[PDB]
Design a protein around this ligand. Structure first.
Ligand SMILES: CCCCC/C=C/C/C=C/C/C=C\C/C=C\CCCC(=O)O[C@H](COC(=O)CCCCCCCCCCCCCCCCC)COP(=O)(O)O[C@@H]1[C@H](O)[C@H](O)[C@@H](OP(=O)(O)O)[C@H](OP(=O)(O)O)[C@H]1O
Ligand SMILES: CCCCCCCCCCCCCCCCCC(=O)OC[C@H](COP(=O)(O)OCCN)OC(=O)CCCCCCCCCCCCCCCCC
Ligand SMILES: CC(C)CCC[C@@H](C)[C@H]1CC[C@H]2[C@@H]3CC=C4C[C@@H](O)CC[C@]4(C)[C@H]3CC[C@]12C
Ligand SMILES: CC(C)CCC[C@@H](C)[C@H]1CC[C@H]2[C@@H]3CC=C4C[C@@H](O)CC[C@]4(C)[C@H]3CC[C@]12C
Ligand SMILES: CC(C)CCC[C@@H](C)[C@H]1CC[C@H]2[C@@H]3CC=C4C[C@@H](O)CC[C@]4(C)[C@H]3CC[C@]12C
Ligand SMILES: CC(C)CCC[C@@H](C)[C@H]1CC[C@H]2[C@@H]3CC=C4C[C@@H](O)CC[C@]4(C)[C@H]3CC[C@]12C
Ligand SMILES: CC(C)CCC[C@@H](C)[C@H]1CC[C@H]2[C@@H]3CC=C4C[C@@H](O)CC[C@]4(C)[C@H]3CC[C@]12C
Ligand SMILES: CCOC(=O)C1=C(COCCN)NC(C)=C(C(=O)OC)[C@@H]1c1ccccc1Cl
Ligand SMILES: *[C@@H]1O[C@H](CO)[C@@H](O)[C@H](O)[C@H]1NC(C)=O
Ligand SMILES: [Ca+2]
Lengths: 38, 858, 242, 60
C-alpha cells in the first residue's frame, strides 16, 4: 500500500536492511533538519 | 497388457536392474575354471534376472509391435543373454566369454532416469565439434607411424648375451637394445656380446617392426606415458643423435597442440551454451537468492535485539553477547584460538617426545571446551534457528558435533577419524573477510551449493562409466594376470574394488601402458588375435579422459562465471548505493635506437656464452675461451652503465643490471675461500637473460600480464594450499610410521629385520643369493606434515601414486611391517584427494584463468 | 584421381614389415618408382597448364615440387646410404588433410594465433633456459649410473641434455625419481678433481624440481589460454548466421 | 659417549655426546652412504632414515 503509491509524502526515505545503518539514516536527516530552524 | 506398463512396474524393473549390478560385483573371476558357493548361487540369480528381463520385453514387444536406441539395447541385451545361457547349458567359441554383454545392463540406469539422460545428452553433444581434432590426431598418428616404420624398423632386436652362449639375456633383469662394433648405439663391452635375436624391450610389444605396432607405440608416446622409455630404447638401438627430433616433435605436435585445440573448442562450446542459457535467466534466480538471504539475518537480528531492549532479566543479559561477537576483538581471539588448534594438530609427528604427546592432548581438550563454550554462547544470542541460518555456522555446528562425538570415545580403536579438528582450519578462512576477494571465494561456494544437483548428476554419470568399464575389465582379464613371474601384479582385475582401482589408475593415465602389456600377455602375446585386446585400454583411456574433461571443466567454468557475474552485480549495487548516499548528504647516447639494439644482442651473446660451458670438467680448453670471453662481455655492460649513470641519478631494472654487473665484477676476484662463495655467485649469473626485459618491448608487456595473472589467481593458490595442508594432516593421522618394510618379507619389526637372508634369482630354487636385511621406509611417507605435503603433491602430479597407494593399503600398525591387502578401504582417501585437488582444483584454476582473460579485452 | 593415387601410395608405404621377403621388397621398389613417375607426370602437366609463373604461386605447389624432386633423386641413390630422403613420400599426405573446410580453418586460425603471440612462448623458452643452466651448474657433476635415473640418456652434463631432462620433467615422467637421484650423497664424476667420497649433489633438488613443475604448468596454461582468447572469435562462431 | 658424532653433514667430525643410544642417518634410496652419525634416536625429515644402536661405536 505504501510502495505502489509514489513516495512523494516521505521527505526522506530509509532504505537499509540493518539496524545499524538505519539508525544513522534517521539521525542524519534529523540533525541537518535540526539546524534549519535555529 | 498395455495397462500395467506405467504403474511402479517401471520402478520394479529399475530395482531389478540394480540387483543385476550388485551381483556382477560380488562375482569373483577365478583362474582356470575355479569357483565357490557364492558363484554357484549367482548363476541361479542370473537365471532369474534373465527370466524377468524377457517377460518385460515381451510385454513391450507385443504392446507396441524396437525403434528407440534404448529399447533396441534392451532387446539385444535380452536376446544375447538368452543365447549365452542356452549355449552354456548345451555345452555343459569360449562360451563363458560371451557374458560380457551383461555389463551393459547398468547402462539402463540412465534410460529410466531422464534427469540423467539429459546430462548424458549434454556430454554426448559436445563430441561433434571434436571430431575434426580426432581426425587430425588420427592423421598425425598415421604419419608418425609411417615415419617410425621407415626409420626404426627391426633395429631393436639385439641385446647383450654374454660370451658363454645364448641362454637368456645376461644383461640385468631389464635388457636393453645394443649395437655392434660397426653400429652407433650402445655397446655391451666387458664379458658380453651384442648378438642378434631377441624378443624386444616389452616382450616384443614396443617396437616399430609393423605398422600396427608402430601405430600403438606412437599412440602410447602421444599419451605422454612412457615415451622416454621408447626414446631411450631407440637411442640405445640406432644412436643418440637424431631420435629426439622425432620424439620431441611428436610430443609437441600431438600432445600440447592437440590439447590446446581441445581446450579451445570445449571452452568455446561452454561459452556458447552459457550465453544461450543466460537468456532464460537462470542467473537471476541465483542473484535474487543472495540478497534475499543478506536482508534475512539483517532483519531477524533487528527483531531479536529489539526484544532485548524490552519495554526475564534480559537488559543485563543480551547487550554484551551481541556487542562482543561484533566487537572485532572476539573475532581476532577466535582466529588466534584456531591458529593454536592448527599449531597443535600439525605438531604431531612420528616418534615425538613424550611431553609433546601430553601437551597436544591437554590443549586439544582445552580448545574443544573453549570452542564448545563459544558455540553455545553464540547459539542463543542470535536465535537458535537464525544461528543455523548462516552458511559457515552450519560448518561450525557440524565440527563441534563431530568433535564431541569423537572425543568421548577414549576406549575404542582407530582414533584417526577423531582428527576432524583439522576442518576447524576452514573456519579461519574468514581472514579473507578482512582482506579483499572474500566476495569472490564465498560467491564460488554459493554457486557450488546452488548447482550441487547438476554436480552430483555429472559425478554420478562418471561413476556409472567407471563401474561399467570395471565390470568389463573384470570379465576380460579376471583371474588372468597370473603368470609364472615371481612378482605379483598389484593393478589387477581380480575383485570389484581392485578392478575399480585399476580403472581409476588407467583414467589418471599413470602406468596405463603396463596394465595394457599385462592384458596383452594374458591373451597370448604379440599376435593378431591376442593383441586386439588393447582396444579396450585405448577406448577406456580416450573416453575416460574426454568425460573427465567435459565434467570437471564444465563445472568449473559455469560456477566461476556465475560467481564472477554475482560479484560484478554486487559491486555495481554497492557503487550505486554509496553514490546515491553521497548525492544527497553532500548537497648521452644511451637514449639511442641502434645502440640499444646492439647491446641486446650482446646480451643474447652473453646468455649463449654460459650455456656452452662444461658442467663436469672443471678445467677444459673450451672453458678457457668462454671464461676469458665473459671478460670482454662484462666490459661492454660496465661501459654501458657508466655512459648512462651520468644521465640520471633510479628505476627497478637499472637495479637488476647493477646487481648483475657488480656481482660479475666481484666474482672476477674473491679469491680466499673459492669453494662456497664462488659457487653462489656463479649460479647468480643466470640473471643476464632477464635483462632482455625493459630492453625489448613486448617482453615487458607479457611479463606484466603474467604478474597481473599471478596476483589474480593468488586466492585460488592459497585455497588449494590450505586444502593440501588439511589433507596432509589427515594423511599424517592415517599413516604415521606405518609405511615401513623389510627387504625380507618374513620379518615385521626393526629388531627382527637384522642380519642377512637368502634370496633366489628369478625365484630359481637352485640359485640362492645372500643379501642383507634392511628396515626401509617408503620413498614418500606420512611421518610428519612436511613429509606428507610433498607426498600428496607427487600424488596430485599422478607420478608414482599407485606405488604409494598400494604401500598404504598394506600398512596396518605403527612400527610394524606390511600385510597384503589389509585395508583396501583406505584407497578412498587417495581417490577423494585426487578428485578434489588434481581434478577439481586444477580445472577451477584453468577456468579462472580463462574467465579472467575473457572479462579482460572484450 | 590423384587423391586416390596418394592414398594408394600411402597404403603401399604402410606395409613395409620386418623380415619381408625379397619379392616384397622388389615389388615395393618398383611400385614406388611407378608412383614417383606418375607424380612427375602430374608436375609436368601443371607447369605447362599453369606456366612456370603460375605454378610457383600456390604455396601447395612449391611444397609439392620440393617433395617429388626429393623422390626422383631418391631412386638415383637407391640403386647403389642416407635415410632422410625417403621421408618425403609420407609428407604428401597433408594435402588430404588440408581439404576439409573445418580442419583447414581450425588449423589456420590456431597457427595464426600462435604466430601473433611470439613472447608468451618466449617466456617458456627463458624459463627452460634458466632452469637448464641452474641444473647444469648444480647437478652437473653427478655420476652416470645405468641403475640410477641419472645416466647416459638422462643427465645434466650438457645443455641439450639438461633441456631434454627439463622437457621430460615438464611432461611428468619420473620427475620424483630424478629429484630423489639428485639428493646429496652420490659418488660422482671421476673426471673432476681424499675426503671427497660422495661430496656432490644438493638438497636444492626439492625446491628446484617443485618450482620448475609449478612454473612450467602455470606458463603452459597461460600460453594455452592466451592462444584460446586470441582465437575466441572462431571458437564461438554461430555458423548458421552470416 | 663416543659413538660417531656430528652436527653438520659434509665433514663428518665428532662432537661431545652422551647416552647409550647412537644412530646412523642416510637417504632411503642411497642406502650405502651414511649422511650423519651421532647419538640418541632422532627423527629424520626427508628423505633420511634413522637406525639406532645400543653400544659404543655400534654405528658403522
Ligand atoms: C614437414 C612438415 C612441414 C610442412 C610444411 C608444409 C607446408 C605446405 C604448404 C602450405 C601452404 C600454406 C597454406 C596452407 O595450406 O595452410 C592451411 C592448411 O595447412 C596446414 O595447416 C598444414 C598442417 C600440417 C600439420 C601436420 C603435421 C604433422 C606431421 C609432421 C611430421 C614431422 C616429422 C618430423 C620427424 C623427423 C624425424 C627425424 C590452409 O591455408 P588457407 O589460408 O588456404 O586456409 C584458409 C583458412 O581456412 C581461412 O580461414 C580461409 O581463407 P583466408 O581467411 O583467406 O586464409 C579459408 O577457410 P574458411 O573460409 O573456411 O575460413 C581457407 O582458404
Ligand atoms: C621450450 C624450449 C625447450 C623445449 C624442449 C625441446 C627438447 C630439446 C631436445 C634437444 C636435446 C636432446 C638430446 C640430444 O640432442 O642428445 C645429445 C646429442 C649427442 O649425444 P651424445 O651424448 O654426444 O652421444 C654421443 C653418441 N652420438 O646432441 C647432439 O648431437 C644434438 C644437439 C642439438 C641441440 C639442439 C639445438 C638445435 C640447433
Ligand atoms: C561391453 C560392451 C562394449 C559390449 C560387449 C562387447 C564385447 C566385450 C564382446 C562382443 C563380441 C564378443 C566376442 C565374440 C566372439 C569371441 C570369439 C571367441 O573365440 C571368444 C569370445 C569372443 C572374443 C567374444 C568376447 C567378448 C566380445 C568381444
Ligand atoms: C600453524 C601451521 C600453519 C604451521 C605449523 C608448523 C609447525 C607446527 C610444524 C611444521 C613442520 C613441522 C616439523 C616437520 C618435521 C620435523 C622433523 C622432526 O624433528 C620432527 C619434528 C619437526 C621439526 C616438525 C615440528 C613441527 C613443525 C615445525
Ligand atoms: C572397450 C569397449 C567399450 C570396446 C572395445 C571392445 C573390446 C572389449 C573387444 C572388441 C574385440 C575383442 C577381441 C576380439 C578377439 C579376440 C581374440 C581372442 O582369441 C581373445 C579375445 C579377443 C582379444 C577379444 C577381446 C575383447 C575385444 C578387444
Ligand atoms: C632461443 C634461444 C634461447 C636459443 C639458445 C640456443 C643455445 C643456448 C644452444 C643452441 C645450440 C647449442 C649448442 C649445440 C651443441 C653443443 C655441443 C655439445 O657438446 C656442448 C653444447 C653445445 C656447444 C650447445 C651449447 C648451447 C647452444 C649454443
Ligand atoms: C590400411 C592398411 C592397408 C595399412 C597397412 C596394414 C597391413 C598392410 C599390415 C598391418 C599388419 C601387417 C602384418 C602383421 C604381421 C605380419 C607377420 C610378419 O612375419 C610378416 C608380415 C605380416 C603378415 C604383416 C604384413 C602387413 C600387414 C598386413
Ligand atoms: C600452478 C600449478 O601447480 C600445480 O601443478 C599443482 C599441483 C599439481 O598439479 C595438478 C595436476 N593434476 N599440486 C598441488 C597440490 C598444488 C599446490 O600445492 O597448490 C599450492 C599445485 C596447484 C597450485 C595452484 C593451483 C592449483 C594447483 Cl592444482
Ligand atoms: C655406479 O656404477 C658402478 C659401475 O659398476 C657400480 O659399481 C656402482 O654400484 C654404481 N652405483 C650404485 C649406487 O649402485
Ligand atoms: Ca607417468
Amino acid at each position: 500500500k505504501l510502495v505502489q503509491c509514489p513516495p512523494e509524502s516521505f521527505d526522506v526515505i530509509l532504505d537499509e536492511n540493518q539496524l545499524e545503518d538505519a539508525c544513522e539514516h534517521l539521525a542524519e536527516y534529523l540533525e541537518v533538519y535540526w539546524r534549519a530552524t535555529h | 497388457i498395455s495397462i500395467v506398463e506405467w504403474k511402479p512396474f517401471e520402478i520394479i524393473i529399475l530395482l531389478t536392474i540394480f540387483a543385476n549390478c550388485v551381483a556382477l560385483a560380488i562375482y569373483i573371476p577365478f583362474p582356470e575354471d575355479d569357483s565357490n558357493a557364492t558363484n554357484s548361487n549367482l548363476e541361479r540369480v542370473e537365471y532369474l534376472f534373465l527370466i524377468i528381463f524377457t517377460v518385460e520385453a515381451f510385454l513391450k514387444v507385443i504392446a507396441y509391435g524396437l525403434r528407440n536406441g534404448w529399447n533396441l539395447l534392451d532387446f539385444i541385451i535380452v536376446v544375447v543373454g538368452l543365447f549365452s545361457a542356452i549355449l552354456e547349458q548345451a555345452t555343459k567359441f569360449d562360451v563363458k566369454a560371451l557374458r560380457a554383454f551383461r555389463v551393459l545392463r547398468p547402462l539402463r540406469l540412465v534410460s529410466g532416469v531422464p534427469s540423467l539422460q539429459v546430462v548424458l545428452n549434454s556430454i554426448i553433444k559436445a563430441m561433434v565439434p571434436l571430431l575434426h581434432i580426432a581426425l587430425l590426431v588420427l592423421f598425425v598418428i598415421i604419419i608418425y607411424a609411417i615415419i617410425g616404420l621407415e626409420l626404426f624398423m627391426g633395429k631393436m632386436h639385439k641385446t647383450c648375451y654374454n660370451q658363454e652362449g645364448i641362454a637368456d639375456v645376461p644383461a640385468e633383469d631389464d635388457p636393453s637394445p645394443c649395437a655392434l662394433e660397426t653400429g652407433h648405439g650402445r655397446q655391451c663391452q666387458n664379458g658380453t656380446v651384442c648378438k642378434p635375436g631377441w624378443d624386444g624391450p616389452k616382450h616384443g610389444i614396443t617396437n616399430f617392426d609393423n605398422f600396427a605396432f608402430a601405430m600403438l607405440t606412437v599412440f602410447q608416446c602421444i599419451t605422454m606415458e612412457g615415451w622416454t622409455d621408447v626414446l631411450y630404447w631407440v637411442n640405445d638401438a640406432v644412436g643418440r643423435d637424431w631420435p629426439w627430433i622425432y620424439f620431441v616433435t611428436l610430443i609437441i605436435i600431438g600432445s600440447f597442440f592437440v590439447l590446446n585445440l581441445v581446450l579451445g573448442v570445449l571452452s568455446g562450446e561452454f561459452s556458447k551454451e552459457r550465453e544461450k542459457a543466460k537468456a532464460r535467466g537462470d542467473f537471476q534466480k541465483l542473484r535474487e537468492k543472495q540478497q534475499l538471504e543478506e536482508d534475512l539475518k539483517g532483519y531477524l537480528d533487528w527483531i531479536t535485539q529489539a526484544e532485548d531492549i524490552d519495554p526475564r532479566w534480559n537488559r543485563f543479559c543480551r547487550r554484551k553477547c551481541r556487542a562482543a561477537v561484533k566487537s572485532n576483538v572476539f573475532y581476532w581471539l577466535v582466529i588466534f584460538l584456531v591458529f593454536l588448534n592448527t599449531l597443535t594438530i600439525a605438531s604431531e609427528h612420528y616418534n615425538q617426545p613424550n611431553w609433546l604427546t601430553e601437551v597436544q592432548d591437554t590443549a586439544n581438550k582445552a580448545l574443544l571446551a573453549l570452542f564448545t563454550a563459544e558455540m553455545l554462547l553464540k547459539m542463543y544470542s542470535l536465535g537458535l534457528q537464525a544461528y543455523f541460518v548462516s552458511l559457515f555456522n552450519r560448518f561450525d555446528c557440524f565440527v563441534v558435533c563431530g568433535g564431541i562425538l569423537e572425543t568421548i570415545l577414549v576406549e575404542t580403536k582407530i582414533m584417526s577419524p577423531l582428527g576432524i579438528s583439522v576442518l576447524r582450519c576452514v573456519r579461519l578462512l574468514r581472514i579473507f573477510k578482512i582482506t579483499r576477494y572474500w566476495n569472490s571465494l564465498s560467491n564460488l561456494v554459493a554457486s557450488l551449493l546452488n548447482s550441487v544437483r547438476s554436480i552430483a548428476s555429472l559425478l554420478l554419470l562418471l561413476f556409472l562409466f567407471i563401474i561399467i568399464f570395471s565390470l568389463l575389465g573384470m570379465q576380460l582379464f579376471g583371474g588372468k594376470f597370473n603368470f609364472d613371474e615371481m612378482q605379483t601384479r598389484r593393478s589387477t582385475f581380480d575383485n570389484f574394488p581392485q578392478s575399480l582401482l585399476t580403472v581409476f589408475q588407467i583414467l589418471t593415465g599413470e602406468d596405463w601402458n603396463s596394465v595394457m602389456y599385462d592384458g596383452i600377455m594374458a591373451y597370448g602375446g604379440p599376435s593378431f588375435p591376442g593383441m586386439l585386446v588393447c582396444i579396450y585400454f585405448i577406448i577406456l583411456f580416450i573416453c575416460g579422459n574426454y568425460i573427465l574433461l567435459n565434467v570437471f571443466l564444465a563445472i568449473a567454468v559455469d560456477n566461476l562465471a556465475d560467481a564472477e557475474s554475482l560479484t560484478s552485480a554486487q559491486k555495481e549495487e554497492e557503487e550505486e548505493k554509496e553514490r546515491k548516499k553521497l548525492a544527497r548528504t553532500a548537497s648521452r647516447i644511451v637514449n639511442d635506437t641502434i645502440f640499444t639494439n646492439l647491446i641486446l644482442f650482446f646480451i643474447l651473446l652473453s646468455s649463449i656464452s654460459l650455456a656452452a660451458e662444461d658442467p663436469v670438467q672443471h678445467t677444459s680448453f673450451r672453458n678457457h675461451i668462454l671464461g676469458n670471453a665473459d671478460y670482454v662481455f662484462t666490459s661492454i655492460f660496465t661501459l654501458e652503465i657508466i655512459l648512462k649513470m651520468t644521465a640520471y641519478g633510479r628505476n627497478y631494472f637499472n637495479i637488476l643490471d647493477l646487481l648483475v654487473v657488480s656481482v660479475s665484477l666481484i666474482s672476477f676476484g674473491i679469491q680466499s675461500s673459492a669453494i662456497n662463495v664462488v659457487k653462489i655467485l656463479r649460479v647468480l649469473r643466470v640473471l643476464r637473460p632477464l635483462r632482455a626485459i625493459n630492453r625489448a618491448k613486448g617482453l615487458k608487456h607479457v611479463v606484466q600480464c603474467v604478474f597481473v595473472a599471478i596476483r589474480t589467481i593468488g586466492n585460488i593458490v592459497i585455497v588449494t594450499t590450505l586444502l593440501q595442508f588439511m589433507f596432509a594432516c589427515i594423511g599424517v593421522q592415517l599413516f604415521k610410521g606405518k609405511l615401513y618394510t623389510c627387504s625380507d618379507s618374513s620379518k615385521q619389526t626393526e629388531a627382527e629385520c637384522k642380519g642377512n637372508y637368502i634370496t633366489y634369482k628369478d625365484g630359481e630354487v637352485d640359485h640362492p643369493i645372500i643379501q642383507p636385511r634392511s628396515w626401509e621406509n617408503s620413498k614418500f611417507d606420512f611421518d610428519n606434515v612436511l613429509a606428507a605435503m610433498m607426498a600428496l603433491f607427487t600424488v596430485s602430479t599422478f607420478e608414482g601414486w599407485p606405488e604409494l597407494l598400494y604401500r598404504s593399503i598394506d600398512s596396518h600398525t605403527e612400527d610394524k611391517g606390511p600385510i597384503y591387502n589389509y585395508r583396501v578401504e583406505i584407497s578412498i582417501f587417495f581417490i577423494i584427494y585426487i578428485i578434489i585437488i588434481a581434478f577439481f582444483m586444477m580445472n577451477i584454476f584453468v577456468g579462472f584463468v580463462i574467465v579472467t582473460f575473457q572479462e579482460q579485452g572484450e | 584421381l590423384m587423391f586416390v593415387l596418394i592414398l594408394l601410395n600411402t597404403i603401399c608405404l604402410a606395409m613395409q614389415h620386418y623380415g619381408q621377403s625379397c619379392l616384397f621388397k622388389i615389388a615395393m621398389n618398383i611400385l614406388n618408382m611407378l608412383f614417383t613417375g606418375l607424380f612427375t607426370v602430374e608436375m609436368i602437366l601443371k607447369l605447362i597448364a599453369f606456366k612456370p609463373k603460375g605454378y610457383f604461386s600456390d604455396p601447395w605447389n612449391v611444397f609439392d615440387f620440393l617433395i617429388v624432386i626429393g623422390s626422383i633423386i631418391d631412386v638415383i641413390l637407391s640403386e647403389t646410404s642416407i635415410t632422410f630422403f625417403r621421408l618425403f613420400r609420407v609428407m604428401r599426405l597433408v594435402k588430404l588433410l588440408s581439404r576439409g573446410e573445418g580442419i583447414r580453418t581450425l588449423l589456420w586460425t590456431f597457427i595464426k594465433s600462435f604466430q601473433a603471440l611470439p613472447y608468451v612462448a618466449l617466456l617458456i623458452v627463458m624459463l627452460f633456459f634458466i632452469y637448464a643452466v641452474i641444473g647444469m651448474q648444480v647437478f652437473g657433476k653427478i655420476a652416470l649410473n645405468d641403475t640410477t635415473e641419472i645416466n647416459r640418456n638422462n643427465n645434466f652434463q650438457t645443455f641439450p641434455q639438461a633441456v631434454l631432462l627439463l622437457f621430460r620433467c615438464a611432461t611428468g615422467e619420473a620427475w620424483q625419481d630424478i629429484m630423489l637421484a639428485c639428493m646429496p650423497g652420490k659418488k660422482c664424476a671421476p673426471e673432476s678433481e681424499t675426503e671427497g667420497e660422495t661430496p656432490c649433489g644438493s638438497s636444492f633438488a626439492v625446491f628446484y624440481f617443485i618450482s620448475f613443475y609449478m612454473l612450467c604448468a602455470f606458463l603452459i596454461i597461460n600460453l594455452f589460454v592466451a592462444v584460446i582468447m586470441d582465437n575466441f572469435d572462431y571458437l564461438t562462431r554461430d555458423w548458421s548466421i552470416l | 659417549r663416543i659413538c660417531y658424532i656430528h652436527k653438520a653433514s659434509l665433514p663428518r667430525a665428532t662432537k661431545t655426546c652422551v647416552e647409550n643410544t647412537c644412530y646412523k642417518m642416510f637417504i632411503r634410496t642411497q642406502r650405502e652412504y651414511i649422511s650423519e652419525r651421532g647419538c640418541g634416536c632422532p627423527t629424520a625429515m626427508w628423505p633420511y632414515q634413522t637406525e639406532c644402536c645400543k653400544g659404543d661405536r655400534c654405528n658403522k
